[model samples]
Target chain A: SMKVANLGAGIGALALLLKTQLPSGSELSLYDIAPVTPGVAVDLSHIPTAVKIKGFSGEDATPALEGADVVLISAGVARKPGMDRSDLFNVNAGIVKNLVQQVAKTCPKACIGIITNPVNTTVAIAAEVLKKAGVYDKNKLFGVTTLDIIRSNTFVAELKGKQPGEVEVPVIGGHSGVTILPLLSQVPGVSFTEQEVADLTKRIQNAGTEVVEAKAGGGSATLSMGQAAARFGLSLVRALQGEQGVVECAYVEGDGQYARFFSQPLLLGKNGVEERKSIGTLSAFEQNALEGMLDTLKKDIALGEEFVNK
Target chain B: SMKVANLGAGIGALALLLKTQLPSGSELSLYDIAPVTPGVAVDLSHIPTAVKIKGFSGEDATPALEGADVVLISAGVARKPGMDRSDLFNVNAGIVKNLVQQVAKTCPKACIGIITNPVNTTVAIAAEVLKKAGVYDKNKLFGVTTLDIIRSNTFVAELKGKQPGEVEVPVIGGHSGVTILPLLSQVPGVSFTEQEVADLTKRIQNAGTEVVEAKAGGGSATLSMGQAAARFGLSLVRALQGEQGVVECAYVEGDGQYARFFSQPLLLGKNGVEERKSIGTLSAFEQNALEGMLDTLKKDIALGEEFVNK
Candidate 1:
């Protein structure tokens, strides 16, 4: 059976959708440090699906992570109103660090996905922790950036009067703020005006904030966050099943062309990443935006790396 | 475009899951009087799905209910500590009474599925309300009991070591306590000892309570409840698409042989409730349980009918 586990199965959204994505007889293990997940497990277990679910909470994720083939770490605090991005990284970094520490020991060979926020940094945090634990594999570790692509598709289709599912935009760089870059020119047969490109870029960059301000500080996005995470997880699962030509995008360890860590199109293999697709030809605006943002992106990556090295 | 709306899309579980069930060019409208749903719509909108989402909140749900083809009412206060079934019915009945009053005016042609609790009574309340509005279509109104069948299949699978999706169980009668009946003898190619039957039946009947206890009073079942509701809605949608032989079990208007309203397997056609499949055969225990539960079911049914008749 294909086994996948989500650490920090918070609020039950990602875990809910991920369970839906699994094929018949796939095993989903959900571990949240919060006490509420056992109830979520019992509730999910009653849904009459072919997928087997085991929900664990109350400190130990050991049992849940014992044999995980893939692990998604989304267990961390949300960005509150007064906190800056670095503040979020500090709290979230530790959450991811500890979870990955366990993941390093328990499911070391598993394809590890980092979903704890500030993924630009947390992903780096995971790499260093795994490296120290002697389980580092560049191909097997990822920072999920599928959320940006999801929002990019939604926004582009909304503006272009097309179905969202049929629209695909290559999103790269990182997962937060201006560092989140969507390659509008890459979408086949979909050209945008300069002004429209500017507006769309801003919107996609701030989409997470839009949900944040929309909720008025209650919480960051849940349904979309969960949906995107599940998509990435499912994509990860499909490729791990030895399927061919599975391509997706994520923040992963790569040669230091742009940065030591950055989001790029990835060709996934059974063991993990097979190839990293290039940034490709960029429009003038896309090039300018990417080049401008890389400085901040580099700093964020360094923040994560130094968090481990020191 | 197919238009489906959920009234009382509270806590965002059912609303989130249901959005995933719709196909391209479908529209999902979510309404909650709870003041938190506008934010939910924004979150769901970011998912790259073909379904169009419009979320509404406040004292009025007029915008979301307009011209809906299918309306599912899941809005109600959750049962809390110290509250009995009747106490729940009072609050939830009023919630349904108002929402249906609007649906009776705004979307009289819509197939309405009631998910507000105490389904034993709420379904009748919806019927009387629709009748008063002169828009009553017994065929188009339903009390969702799919949750029962879902749990029955799950519990049976766990007991017998079978795959849950392959195991079909007809759950008849109401949705609470002794009134919830799982037709154990009806499961094909599977037989159970009397003790296994009793244990399974009680577990299925008490499954809702089991979740309630598991959550320790904060909430009832969310993921499974939403999944079951979505499955029922999707099945209803498929039948509405005019496919053949889409059979499901639901509580709906039926002959007086059992009660004014009872659960039965129905062959669902485009117009809903095309044919009521008979309860067929019953074991000794089944026959006794059905006979034993009718008085209470009758009382609950009358409690609702008289609420309007008076």
Candidate 2:
């Protein structure tokens, strides 16, 4: 039985995760800083799946994290009207840092999956926090960038008229804006024109904002995030349970010298990052986008570190 | 812009209900007693619907119930293995009392719907609790027996080789075992042999258990419950919002006899159960079953009242 703790247990994501993963009698602890904690717990507890739910609210975050095998964080304020990018990032970054610090102290050996907005930076912040706590394990951290991979696969399949789920795209890079680079050339046996590549890249990058704008200050992508997070979490679970072929794109310390870290497909296992799957090769367009995103991605990573320190 | 309070916020039932009835952008308070509360809130909150999910967990249940125009209670323990019918009755009956006690005090004016099980006993418990609290309105209380109706309609349709949603079985009786009686004869423009009626009745009565068994203890009928609860909640919302002739089967207090109450079809309107719809007529065999069920139903009703005083 996998005991998972969801920090910031943001609606839907935890609900769907528990619905799919928690076997009969597994315990899921939901932590939030809000008043609605118990209701969330009660809602999913009724699922006849043997998953038990416990809600811990306010400042009591450590007890929830104490023995969790995985701590998935999706806390912080959501996208709202008139909010600029920084506004969203700033709020969520702080929430992530506070939570990561507790996770570092308690479940330091647990896999940490971040779902906060500005995940590109929040993952960096989590890394910096764990580092400061002297418990940082590069292999143990994950920034759920699977949504990018999911969308890339879904959209390209839609465009090429191939069946969806049959198409696979490597969504490598940070989980934000231009940092979200989809390796179109690597899309399994599917070819796209340069025009299509450019258009698809932009769409994948702006999908979050597309939902934000569509919601018009109402809310952002929650259902997709839940599914994505669950996919990532399940991958980790499968990996830890000694299943083979478990791979997902996550932000981790890089072997390449381009920057301190990069997002790539990682083959996860009992000890976390068992193998960093090679990116194979990149097309000129993908190579160019990767080089172009470096400077800003580095800056975003730095900003997250600074926000956590502050 | 109806502010709805979804008590028990199971899976996405409450959220789905809010999505259909309230316009996109309505504020929602999702109340439950489990850890998965925030997940449901976060997921539903993401729907571009105007609904915002605030996950509430704790003793301060009434605050979530406060100032809402409509309240829905889907809280309580479900049936479990090694747990006989009486065991389920004890667990859910207490839960219903606790929740309705709060609703009676906090949002007595809001029309309340009960989706907890032993629906027959739980709703009866709620009615008595509210009555003791001095806020019970027989006209405003409801036992959500929609799932039973839906199962009958769908199962009957399947056997008759008709589209499931196209048929309608006027399902009456309580939300349990023999208490769950489906009037196959009353299904419009349809006929059933005595054998078919008996088969359908038995199946419909055991549908919840069937789902439980199919899941092999993996889960109960959450997805289906969400669907049924959403449909019933929306119908109530529509009726309360001034839609006319919104007729549905619900368990509510009956005419001045037969213990505390019974379940029958009712015409929902702005003032809640504005009119009691007739159960039409029944075949001699059906009439005998109905008569036989009364004593047991009455005892179930008494058990609920007995619980409150103790």
Candidate 3:
């Protein structure tokens, strides 16, 4: 019913999972700077699913972006040990800026889900890029914070001895350490000890680094991240297709009480964010976590804005 | 109820799909000579599924194979144009033998699926290897010819203007060249003209080369092959779990009328091949095609048996 595309990082596992996830006969566009990307599309094309896929490779992503209803950005280097924030900003932010520039020019109205790291910032950078193109839509830009929710659910399930598939944990705020806040209070039919709450919150916040260290620097979290990206992208598509009551947590431009680009429960409709849901009543620890995460989240958002302005 | 392992080829897409495909709480083992394999397990572990996964890296696959209920082998080089018959034999055949040797010593009762090409030959080599180990079970050995079936279904679905997902084309004989025989005559509710039959048969046989050529020398059908392998692996698991009335086509030890190793639809059971289904009715053209394919398939089978002996 619609066309979707994934930038660089989503090519391997993301494209594989995303194509399988989408309704049959949907079109998928894949593009990357790497020469091997189009070949990836051809490999995926052979799968028996009826999703019609075409890949465009080379320095430009315009062909892939041309008519995409949703374009997910996952192109960027992962943070390595000892890499400074400035080092990350220059490289990853630069990659996102370039890719989002193409999105601005070719498919401005398409829902842009940014999965690149420094997501809190890169998403902001994309917003600025769209604004500069004079095509900015507040509802259309999102920073994918679904991984935080995924990890939270998995960790919570492990501790609670529940099925991971049956668990759900809503995550909010920026997608980074300390900035990630899990709404454990909102988890239905679950009561957690205070000690459990502190530990689960911390683990969910640092799950990415846990994997990074576990790999011993082989690479950081590609498979889970791919799954994370696909789920978010699919939910976005389902919402865009006019499916009723599709709710997902995403970093977006919301009410000014929090940071401008804050992650919250979004009621998605045909034109993207139809409503930003409430944060709900919080436990003492939850209130503290929400308040503590804002300064850093706001600072990260401005870093991206300043990068574009100066 | 079982432990499964994939050698070399199943790490990326296969593991991702197979992990998702398998009933939760199953254990999936992955191994490769390359060092990044264990890291792949870590990446996949982060996914919010109950399937437990472990990876072993380095030259030996014994640790991964130990106590496994099923093992899928795909650790061999593909044929490049004009790469002599002897070259593929010495490489892929040799690789399969070593892996099967470990399979014999470690998990003797395991269902062994051969996906490394020259599959027509390598499956024979695996049987001979296990026979020499005094632990061969005819029912437990399979040469995965599922990819041929997959391609046939897709191509036929395209020409008939049907959903590829719902299409089923049973392919038999050996897995290479003219040896691939697709029984389009058996397709229910479908009739084809002589020209369409001729065109479809040839296209089904050469689909591998089609992808190899399409890739323009990068790689040969890893994504599709990965999907193909995952489907076969999952079916084997289901059959072993005692799922009733499960049928699949695979290259295995069949009747003396064909070669010792042949591809046909098998009704799989708790122990492996419960029944080998008939090829059903063939058209006049299909009868000739089947008759013509025997010599080449027999030659390929003996080539593998000869490699094991001499």
Candidate 4:
């Protein structure tokens, strides 16, 4: 009887995904602020797959979040060509906070994965809003840094000539620019040349913007994000069902060690983060990159927290 | 120097897909006839994911198919709710024929995966067109029956509570309706109740129609098909590069004279159709179902073959 909510029902990728993947009896809902989501819901409702998808579109995000076991927030402004996360953060941070407040009120026990950008900041805002609503749990809140980890593993696997599922890259810091650090030293059973590592690190940081420009002011990485969200969601499902050793890196509240929030690998359990693993002995290059990311991420997190408080 | 033509570029699933998955140095030419695709191509080109995408449209299907090593055809009308394969077949068959003709003329050797419906019939139409063009090799043509197999294996796995990847359902006969015979007897270590078998089979047959209805007269399964097509195309790639023992059920010509054309599991090789595996063994229920489907499948195939001969 677990209920899942997929926000941002454009073209209904997550809706289609859950329809195809989940068992037929799961209750699913889709939310978009636009008026067309009802149509989207009507559309997804015909799939004979297990999940029953209802679409919700209203000024308030609360109805969409109500009673959801997993509230997947991919709502926000799309990225455009020549735009940075700051350009995104200014608008989407408010959108995420507004949504999270409703999520806090309606489904506090639900696990939330934020796909809104700038995820680093938007997740912080979500945390703050949930906290103010007096229902914040560091363990259950997640900033979807899954895509970065997915991209890193894919890119590194391609260059290293290995199957993608075998490559593991620990994406740390934040989800934007220099803050999106791929810890090359931590990737299991894979080694990147120094030059390849430098090139790939920059590529991972700029991949979203690359998609925005390729779209040339048309659309954002909605499909990729949908795939990423499904991947992470599936991982959570697997872990929740008593799968052993399910660990993934996502942005969640830290113990005030690095910042108000940080992205790290956590062992996932049935109730969310079972344990937060330490960043663990960074390599010289990784350490240097961490130093470079500190100031920018600090500002990003602060800007987000302030947005909620203000 | 191989160009890949991405048909049905409207879904944007392939654009984002090839963006991340395609090896660097690959070139992709795209066509959609939807005015939105060129904009999508321009957008995907900036990702630095290595594959360069160029968009094309209008009466230039040949140019798009020119020298393509792989032709991914997902063109045709999507299913609407309350629609049957016949409703889709009328429109999609013509589209498949027209497109496959261009493919045969331009890149006769390029492996083609038909993602259109009545997939069972449309694939036959494609093969006939290629045969008429006199470039057909039984080995070189494929009907993308992978999805049916995929769905069968997935649903079966879910029902039996086994891992999806570890389960294999040998889907035989065709890609629509009763022709989709899921051989449960063969799946090692997996068993289903009689009710599970009947319900699972019905759902698999109706899944496409379900999506057609779900789209509520809007669109069909674009995202799922993209993933399916990519998986099949990747198999072709692996097979072409001499990966051994890669057997998949695809709609193909010359399946041991039971009928002129059928879908069966075939071992893909560098030269294609290295071997076609027989349906092996069937349970009493499966035997009855296979016998029941043949008449319907023959009629479907005849309609396709008649389209060209007339």
- Candidate 1 vs candidate 2: the DockQ winner is 1
Ranking by lDDT: 1, 3, 4, 2
Task: Give the Cα RMSD of candidate 3.
Answer: 2.1
Best by TM-score: 1
Q: Which regions of candidate 1 deviate over 4 angstroms?
A: A79-87, B80-83, B216-218
Model 4 gets an lDDT of: 0.76
Per-candidate total of colliding backbone pairs: 1, 27, 0, 11
The CA root-mean-square deviation of candidate 2, after full C-alpha superposition on the true structure, stands at: 13.7
Q: Write the per-residue lDDT of candidate 1 for residues A229-250, one digit (tens) a residue.
A: 8998998899989888998999
| Per-residue lDDT of A260 in model 2 | 70
Q: Which stretches of candidate 3 lie over 4 Å from their true place?
A: A9-11, B9-11, B78-88
Question: What are the per-residue Cα lDDT tens digits for candidate 4 across B37-128?
Answer: 66566545533355667777675687677778888888878644465446566778778888888888789998887877777677778888
What part of the reference interface contacts, as a 0 to 1 fraction, does candidate 3 reproduce?
0.54
Model 2: per-residue Cα lDDT over B186-238, one tens digit each: 77778888888888888877776655543345346665566577778788778
Candidate 1: tens digits of C-alpha lDDT, residues B38-97: 778888989888888887877887799897989999888765445687778878888888
Residue-level lDDT tens digits of model 3 in B220-276 = 667778888888999999999989988999999988578898899999999989999
Alpha-carbon shift of residue A62 in model 1 (angstroms): 1.7
